Write a protein that binds this DNA or RNA. Structure first.
Ligand SMILES: [Br-]
Lengths: 58, 78, 58, 81
DNA sequence: TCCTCATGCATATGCATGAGGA
DNA sequence: TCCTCATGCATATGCATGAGG
């Protein structure tokens, strides 16, 4: 069970991370409203991008 | 000697040493499980070799991979 | 002994492919010599680059 | 090499992917089932390339009927369960 | 090893899970 | 009731192999 992002949605979703790396539950919902993804698809994406920022390499 | 440089070097040398032995990333994950009890996935090994893991998780895996290398590099030595 | 292609080497090999898609064994040796690579790695790279060009979707 | 043959390959590739995912099979599950179904096993790599048409037209056309039989058999086992 | 052609091992990684702490 | 954290399934693909011309 996986949901995949087109590509340009990811660029906008990345732009939102660079703007706010830790959004509130409300911001994530509006980010999803602006894009099209489910609200929980976005919650986890911000989790992993935070994880990836906390690594030795990326 | 910084300890972060110790992990970098060890991760780099582990890759070259794994490849010289002819082991895939997945074979290491499985060999460790049978030898040390908890198996790991090809994904986890790949991230270790590329330093795509936390400094805390890199430190937890190093000694495990360190023991496995000793056993694998001495397969031929009687 | 695995062989991986440097990012900028891949651009150079692509640049030569767009100019000549089927080099001779001699040209392969000169490309490999100029790039300091095994001739078979260049030999095989041009094979795969021809194959992928004959895909419905490269 | 007609364009309707290329559109038949595009359409079926989409239909195979959605139906594989609806039935709950991984790409690797398909590769294994065909070995038992046709004797000749296939790899996760080949299934992936097929679903995306990362193959020659000639290669696509030879695999489509094989993958088609597997899907047809699977679509009738799921309506019986 | 020189080509095409069909195919795949091995690997990198996008998306996810779940245990555990605010 | 969202986070952090360790971890991996599933998929895409770079480099390769081997059968055959
Ligand atoms: Br050159």
């Amino acid at each position: 069970k996986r949901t995949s992002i087109e590509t340009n949605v990811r660029f906008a979703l990345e732009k939102s991370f660079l703007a706010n790396q830790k959004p509130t539950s409300e911001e994530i919902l509006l980010i999803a409203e602006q894009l099209h993804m489910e609200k929980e698809v976005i919650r986890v994406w911000f989790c992993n991008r935070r994880q990836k920022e906390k690594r030795i390499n990326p | 000697p910084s300890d972060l440089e110790e992990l970098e070097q060890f991760a780099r040398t582990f890759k070259q040493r794994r490849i010289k032995l002819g082991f895939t990333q997945g074979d290491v994950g499985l060999a460790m499980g049978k030898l040390y009890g908890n198996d790991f996935s090809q994904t986890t090994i790949s991230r270790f070799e590329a330093l795509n893991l936390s400094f805390k998780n890199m430190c937890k895996l190093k000694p495990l991979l360190e023991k496995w290398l000793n056993d694998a590099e001495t397969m031929s030595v009687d």
